[PDB]
Amino acid sequence: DVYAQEKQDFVQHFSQIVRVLTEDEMGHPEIGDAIARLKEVLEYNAIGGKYNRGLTVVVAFRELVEPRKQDADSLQRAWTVGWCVELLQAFFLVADDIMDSSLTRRGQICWYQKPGVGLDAINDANLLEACIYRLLKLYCREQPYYLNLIELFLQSSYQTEIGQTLDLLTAPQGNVDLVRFTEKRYKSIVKYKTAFYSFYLPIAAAMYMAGIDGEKEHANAKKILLEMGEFFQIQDDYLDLFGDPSVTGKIGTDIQDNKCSWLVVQCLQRATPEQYQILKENYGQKEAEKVARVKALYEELDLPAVFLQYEEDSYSHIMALIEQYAAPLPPAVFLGLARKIYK
Amino acid sequence: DVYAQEKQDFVQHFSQIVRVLTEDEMGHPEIGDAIARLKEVLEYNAIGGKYNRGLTVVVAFRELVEPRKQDADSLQRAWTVGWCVELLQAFFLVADDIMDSSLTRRGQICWYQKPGVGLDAINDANLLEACIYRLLKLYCREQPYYLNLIELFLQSSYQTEIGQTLDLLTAPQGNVDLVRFTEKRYKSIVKYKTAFYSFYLPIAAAMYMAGIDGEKEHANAKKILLEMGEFFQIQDDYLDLFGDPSVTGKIGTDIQDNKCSWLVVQCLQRATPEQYQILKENYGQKEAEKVARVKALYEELDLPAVFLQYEEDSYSHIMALIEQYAAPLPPAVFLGLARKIYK
Numbered sequence A, B: 001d002v003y004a005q006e007k008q009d010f011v012q013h014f015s016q017i018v019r020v021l022t023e024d025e026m027g028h029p030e031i032g033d034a035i036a037r038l039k040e041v042l043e044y045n046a047i048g049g050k051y052n053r054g055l056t057v058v059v060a061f062r063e064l065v066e067p068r069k070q071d072a073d074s075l076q077r078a079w080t081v082g083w084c085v086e087l088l089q090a091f092f093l094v095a096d097d098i099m100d101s102s103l104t105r106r107g108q109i110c111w112y113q114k115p116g117v118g119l120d121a122i123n124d125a126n127l128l129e130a131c132i133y134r135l136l137k138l139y140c141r142e143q144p145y146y147l148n149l150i151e152l153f154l155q156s157s158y159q160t161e162i163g164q165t166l167d168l169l170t171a172p173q174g175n176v177d178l179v180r181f182t183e184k185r186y187k188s189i190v191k192y193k194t195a196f197y198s199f200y201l202p203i204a205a206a207m208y209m210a211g212i213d214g215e216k217e218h219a220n221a222k223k224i225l226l227e228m229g230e231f232f233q234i235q236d237d238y239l240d241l242f243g244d245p246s247v248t249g250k251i252g253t254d255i256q257d258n259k260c261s262w263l264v265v266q267c268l269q270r271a272t273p274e275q276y277q278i279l280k281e282n283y284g285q286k287e288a289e290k291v292a293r294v295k296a297l298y299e300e301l302d303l304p305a306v307f308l309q310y311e312e313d314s315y316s317h318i319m320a321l322i323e324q325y326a327a328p329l330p331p332a333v334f335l336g337l338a339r340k341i342y343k
Ligand SMILES: O=C(O)c1ccc2cc(-c3ccc[nH]3)cc(-c3cccc4ccccc34)c2n1
Pocket: A049, A050, A051, A052, A053, A056, A198, A199, A235, A337, A340, A341, A342, A343
């Protein structure tokens, strides 16, 4: 697989990323200790995930550029831009983990929860963000798409931040209000907080690196990619409860943490005034008894069948979007990604 | 005064900054609530200071550009870039206030300490940072210095963050270690954390807006400006204790908060092993008795006279630096700023 194979070369390039990012320690030994801290931040937070967003950059680059044009340097730049996508995510996760008081991320203790880190992780998340632009300068400065990539990473940060704000306003900590847990609000939180950086950003970066800088081609790619992003998060919210941690590697937390999951949202539009009272009394409590009662109300309202029909209808629609908005890009850029997302 | 007069037009332009930054609410009413939160973040955190760094941009622009070239648009851009410097500072302050557990900033409650804000201020500080690049795009996109300004703001953020890391490593919360409170470390924390964004960034932005984009001219301006920055923070650490809150508007906190102040640093290089023990026992305690004992040990080691001689020697050196590195820039760009800084 285009992904599975390239995932080794991708992860092997992290060693160079770290070396280059900690290189100013030579000329400026004054800041050596801060550079040593940066290295630990990169090593803890950029490593441990699946690297799929970063990998999407490398995979789309190979499918958008003529093999003849894909020289050693072009490839080193594609892996660097892939790692910039991974550093953007690492900065948002370090910060979000602090904001929602998380304990673990991918079964490892959150960086901020580590002894001696604490709220210093706020500066660490900022440093992870600064690393993107340092890498873009170091490798893509002389490239004609340099400014396009800077603006894309900056716009993606802003859209994710707007999304994060929307999420925090929708679900205040120590506040029970299912009235604001609407579908229209859910689609908006998903579009800004996840879809842009996870789906639009990787392909968009590959597109500019290929010289595809047209506004219409980017709007066309955006139409497909955000729709894929909307499906993905809906699948993430579903598998969190109605899935299995064997295949996924994540156990149900959405209920205990009062999250604006797609499940609680569809329960809202389809409920008798009595069924709405049951949800209000249970959702948000860390007692295993109350968590068990929520899962039951979803099952009765036939939400697994509501998701199953949503997935069938979603896949069909995304195939229709690819036919309509892929050209002139090779459909395989969108298809390779859709295959990995859908089941 | 070039500052005092222009400070009214500068502050009057904040209304337009907010209007333009909250304008995407029209086409995207989905995110309206997040835009409403952004507006409150801007209004609380960008207003209330003295605006001198932002003002430096406007003042240097007028002294670097021919009056004939200073049209309505050029001026609107200079005020916008000035406000970008103020938003960069607002983002660092919101975040630093969270990290060191501050209660107030300029006598007003810290944003994060406000009811309902808490750790959400982490996303708020990020949004303040995103606003810089949104403003640069909205007003300077078509300008030839566009990329120069983006890279300058990005490099200034990174240098401040590196400085902040250096500070946090030097003074760990709940940790007494005066061994790492050296002069060489102090000058490094001041250079990266304060000097670059406070002194280099405003003039540098004015310089690029004037078409002065040469590497040597920027290195020349940097040599003067960082030296001014080093003096400024040393004066800030001195006036915090040996100053008066009537003129300054700040009362002594450095002692109670175990900060790496220039006073404690000069006390280290000039102390008998017995005088070092006294400092260790007192510095860092919130008891008014222990705070009073520190001030006494400084006075005996003739630190106000050590600062007085430092200020005399510093002003002389900065006049020598201006003679040597101002040309071809009009010396009045550096002099107007030096006058405001020195006494
Ligand atoms: O952090 C990661 O890299 C990560 C972690 C868990 C994942 C789970 C699925 C998945 C769940 C059910 C069917 N498929 C898909 C992807 C994914 C794969 C390929 C490309 C991607 C691009 C953007 C976002 C995700 C992906 C995945 N990526």
